Structure 1
Amino acid sequence: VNFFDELRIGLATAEDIRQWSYGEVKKPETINYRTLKPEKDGLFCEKIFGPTRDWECYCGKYKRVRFKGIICERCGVEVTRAKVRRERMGHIELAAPV
């Protein structure tokens, strides 16, 4: 809960970054300039980080409040508060080591 005996900084690795993230961004497009929504797998797509609203699937299939831990197959997103958007990351894949 609040027990932190120590703190060590380790040097990550490709497999570590694979493990941390939940997606693989592919397009640089930001929020849409017309409908003000993320683009498919864009830099904000809900399929990567989380729903823009809380307890709201992209397609509205499971928009009801009583759904936690249920990933919608129609849109492939999860249902949790908007806060989870603040604590999930994405990893880009490189075609050439750097």
Structure 2
Amino acid sequence: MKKEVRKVRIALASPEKIRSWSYGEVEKPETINYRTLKPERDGLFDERIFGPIKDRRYRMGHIELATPAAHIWFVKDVPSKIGTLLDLSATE
């Protein structure tokens, strides 16, 4: 029943789902410590949020931003996807 793919969906991603496909949240800009070539805790290369570096680029994490932000694409794109949505000055 593993029927090959024939359909591809493209739509906005809800914050909830954001965590869905997320396996851990890095909350520190600590790439890799210089003493040990091993990543620094919940850094951009932790072995728990992503995975082993030996016998890892198929697992994603997230950054629960403090205060909500915005996906520039839905505001800066020619037709203000959201601006025109609320009548607000599309670009201004």
- 1:1-98 alignment to 2 at 5 Å? 3-54=4-55, 85-98=56-69
TM-score when normalising by structure 2: 0.67
TM-score when normalising by structure 1: 0.63
Structure 2 CA distance for aligned equivalents of residues 43 and 36 of structure 1: 13
Cα separation, partners in 2 of 1:10 and 1:53, compared to 1, 3 Å? same
1:8 Cα deviation (Å)? Answer: 1.8
**Could you list the runs of 5+ residues in structure 2 that have no partner in the other structure?**
70-92
Q: Percent same amino acid at aligned positions?
A: 69
CA RMSD of aligned residues (A): 1.4
1:32 Cα deviation (Å)? Answer: 1.2
Regions of 4+ moved over 2 Å: none
**Larger RCO, structure (CA 8 Å, separation 6 or more):** 1
- Paired residue secondary structure (2:57): helix
Structure 2 CA distance for aligned equivalents of residues 53 and 16 of structure 1: 29
Structure 2 CA distance for aligned equivalents of residues 2 and 49 of structure 1: 28
Structure 2 CA distance for aligned equivalents of residues 87 and 2 of structure 1: 22
Question: Higher Cα Rg: structure 1 or 2?
Answer: 2
